[model samples]
Target: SEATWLWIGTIGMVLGTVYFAVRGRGSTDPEQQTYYIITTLIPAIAAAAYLAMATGLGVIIYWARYANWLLTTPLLIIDLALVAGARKQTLYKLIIIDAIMILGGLAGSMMQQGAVIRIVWWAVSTAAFIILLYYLLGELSERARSRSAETGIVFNRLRNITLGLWALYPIVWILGTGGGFGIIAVTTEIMLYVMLDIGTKIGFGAVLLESQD
Candidate 1:
């Protein structure tokens, strides 16, 4: 079942990539171009990661998924930050914090099941994630509002959706993976992730690009 989900994820990610690529066509603005590239690559990279998992390359552990986050999560931040015209200082800080969170989550997932150290790492990651959110809602929100009324509205919508979906990740981690309680089945976890990834990348990007018009 995990493999089945992985295959499905792979297919879903590929389709997302193609959709964005087509949607980005004829965009001449450099800012729009950046969004296009980020959106396209996010799902394109995810497709490869899902394929690796489906083919058993990442069967031993959840390395493939973690690796996917390591790359895509920062891009997600970049997209949001650019949307708000956030300062480089805020953008850099958010990206670094995101890296720390993903690494912490990855490390926790690799630890022995039921180990206390795993919870410690989860706390570390969650803390970092919270800090990142502080900036997202505070400084970034203000920056977006300063730009224009419409930009602020769009930023709020995107940021809200992003954070809302992201909030489930830790719950899913603690319930499904060795990182925490391990109550939910791994196959189901993979399925949820597949849905989350598709919605976060493809659905989010569609809203973002469509708003530009």
Candidate 2:
């Protein structure tokens, strides 16, 4: 079922992050190691919260996971944006907006809520995400021009993929009209959420790690 596959995905997310975190311990550059460790924490709570849903507990884990994002996602954006050469101000802008996005979705996803009201929250979340894409695409491009050719190319690719991949989340949210809490199926939303989370965490981080030159 979807829950089984989602469980596997969460477990993979946790282990993969820990593996990278352990490897980062040996990095000569503190920033490099710091980002690695930072990335690990981002998925820790998310995996647990998701695992809760995959098993039996859901609504609680759903909110817990979103709350966890408020804590963890800042590290991701700050680190990833730093690697991409965005200014400090750009980091804060993206991070703060991301928090709003997470909470917006959480508010919208409550099981007992009206579909109309819920969809509004989803809209708010997606709007915030679009703001993030603007920063990634617009600001990163500006900053990347000053970086090495390789790094610039990497940033370009990262920005493009981030836009495409992240866009899918809102699309999923809008289309999710099925099982859990009058939302999508437990498995459908869970698996899709995990897929995007893994991509954002592992896929996005790998490029930064590989670019450490």
Candidate 3:
């Protein structure tokens, strides 16, 4: 069932990549072209990652998933940072912290499931996430607000959606892996993971394109 779900996720990402590519292909503006490339690549790399999981080609499934995040999460941040018109310093800081968050997650995943150190790593990662959120909702929000009413509205919607969905990830990690609480089944874990993946990548892309039009 997990394998089948990965296949489904792979297909979903492929479709999202195509959708973004076609929609943004004709844009004559340089900025929009950059947006198109980044958005398309987000799901593009995700598809590859999911395909690796579906095929059982990776050493560990979580590693494959983390690899996906390593590539795409920065793009997601870039997309959001650009929308908020954040400065280079702020953007780089967000990206670096985000990398730390995901790498910490990977480190936790590498440990034996239910290991105490895994929880420690989770806490470390979550701390980074909180700091990242502060920047997203605080400094970035203020920047977007000063840009315009419409920019503020769009950035707020996008940032809120991104952060809200992202917040659930660590919880899922704790219940599914770190704690080994076994509160949820493997099926449920994969389902929530895939849903969040789609929500953050494809779903975010759709809304972003919607506002531009």
TM-score for every candidate vs. truth? Answer: 0.96, 0.84, 0.95
Q: Write the per-residue lDDT of candidate 1 for residues 21-108, one digit (tens) a residue.
A: 9888988999889989998989898999999998879757778888899999999899999899999988999989999999999889
lDDT of 2 at 133: 79
lDDT, residue 207, model 2: 67
Model 1 residue runs over 4 Å out of place are none
Worst 10 residues of 2 by lDDT: 177-186
Candidate maximizing lDDT: 1
Give the TM-score (vs. native) of candidate 3. 0.95
Of candidates 3 and 1, the better by TM-score: 1
Tens digit of lDDT per residue, candidate 3, span 124-198?
999999999999989999999999999999999999889999999888887884334557777678778888999
Which digits, one per residue and each the tens of the lDDT, describe model 2 over residues 37-66?
676676676677667666776554365456
User: At residue 58, what lDDT does model 2 achieve?
Assistant: 52
Better lDDT candidate (2, 3): 3
Q: Is candidate 1 or candidate 2 better by lDDT?
A: 1
lDDT of each: 0.88, 0.71, 0.87
Please give the RMSD of candidate 1 to the true structure.
Answer: 1.2
Off by over 4 Å in 3: 178-180
Q: For model 2, name the residue pairs that clash.
A: none
Model 2 bad stretches (over 4 Å): 54-58, 111-113, 177-184
TM-score, prediction 2? 0.84
